[PDB]
Each structure stands twice: as C-alpha cells, then as structure tokens.
Amino acid sequence: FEVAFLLIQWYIYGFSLSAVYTCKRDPCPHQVDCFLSRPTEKTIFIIFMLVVSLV
Amino acid sequence: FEVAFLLIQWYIYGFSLSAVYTCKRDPCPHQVDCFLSRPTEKTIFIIFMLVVSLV
C-alpha cells in the first residue's frame, strides 16, 4: 500500500508546486494564468511527508 | 490619389469588419478576445464609400 500510494502521488502531482499555473479548459478563453496559494510551504511539507513515507 | 487611397485601404483593413477580434500584444496574457462596436453598420458604410470612390 505504501509503494502504491507513492507511485500514484508521483504520477499525479510530482514533488513540487509551481507558483504560476496555465489553464486550458472550457468555458474559458484560449489560455489564462492562475496563481496558487502559498506553494513554498506546501512544497516543504510534501518533502517531509515523502521522507516519512520512505523511512 | 484615388487609386493610391483605395489600395492602402484594401491593404490595411479589407472591406469588412468582424465582430470578434483576437489580440496578442504585450502586456496582456497569451490570447484575449475583444469585441467591436456596431460592425454591421460600419461594413455598410464602408461598402458605400467604396462604391462612391469607384464611381
């Protein structure tokens, strides 16, 4: 179960969060920019949870 | 002078006006949509001025 959850988390999100995201879904126009909320702190806690999972 | 002005007006604008224009200039994002103001009436008057010019 641990290795399955680690593989799914790598496949969906990766192990970082970018501050600027680009969106191409209807019913928006061609391409819009969307800005996340505190991505640095979430990157730090994602790295901590990854380390705990590996241990 | 008449044929020069007709050639310049054909080269810049054409002889119609579309109701939806797409814009790709800085400092906007990737592509935005911009909507004109009464383009049908302006198309009609452009056709009248073209006919008067040719006559």
Side-chain angles (χ1 to χ4, degrees), chain A residues 22 29-33, chain B residues 22 29-33:
Chain A
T22 309
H30 320 291
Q31 268 183 331
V32 300
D33 283 336
Chain B
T22 309
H30 320 291
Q31 268 183 331
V32 300
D33 283 336

Side-chain angles (χ1 to χ4, degrees), chain A residues 19-53:
Chain A
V20 168
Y21 180 72
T22 309
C23 187
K24 203 181 161 58
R25 200 175 175 175
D26 268 356
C28 309
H30 320 291
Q31 268 183 331
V32 300
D33 283 336
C34 296
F35 304 97
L36 262 67
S37 185
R38 54 179 88 181
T40 296
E41 198 164 1
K42 302 180 176 165
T43 311
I44 296 180
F45 283 124
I46 276 167
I47 281 181
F48 276 114
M49 296 318 281
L50 170 64
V51 164
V52 167
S53 282

Side-chain angles (χ1 to χ4, degrees), chain B residues 5-21:
Chain B
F5 266 89
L6 273 187
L7 285 201
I8 291 186
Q9 193 198 320
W10 172 85
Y11 177 69
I12 290 306
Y13 287 115
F15 292 96
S16 80
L17 279 180
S18 43
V20 168
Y21 180 72

